[PDB]
């Protein structure tokens, strides 16, 4: 709506802040192994995926556009990251075999986006 602060400053300065948060969200660890292999109606999707995900992604996709100047703005990046998270959060329970390998990425990147100033204000 209005009164926000997710532009930070420049698209390139964002590629930088995106790097550190890339190390967090994308630490090449087991926590980030299943994130790039989510579920979708095109392949063994799950019941009702338009209210809990609508447009899911794979950590490898947002990464193919992250290193480039495609999703340097936290608005677009945080949009896919957050959705890519909600894609595996709105129905991953709180302690089952789905809300865990991604909960470490949500807690480690949510701390790297503030630095990215997407959460600046």
């Amino acid at each position: 709506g209005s009164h926000m602060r997710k532009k930070i400053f420049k698209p390139e300065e964002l590629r930088q802040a995106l790097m550190p948060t890339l190390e967090a969200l994308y630490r090449q660890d087991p926590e980030s192994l299943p994130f790039r292999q989510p579920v979708d109606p095109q392949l063994l999707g799950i019941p009702d995926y338009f209210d809990i995900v609508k447009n899911p992604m794979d950590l490898s996709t947002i990464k193919r556009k992250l290193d480039t100047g495609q999703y340097q703005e936290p608005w677009q990046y945080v949009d896919d990251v957050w959705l890519m998270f909600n894609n595996a959060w709105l129905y991953n329970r709180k302690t089952s075999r789905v809300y865990k390998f991604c909960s470490k990425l949500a807690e480690v990147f949510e701390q790297e986006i503030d630095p990215v100033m997407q959460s600046l204000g």
Partner: peptide
Amino acid sequence: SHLKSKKGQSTSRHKKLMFK
């Protein structure tokens, strides 16, 4: 039975990827 008999769809308890 030989042919289907009032079957229709069946949720069969399916909770997304938190089980399969």
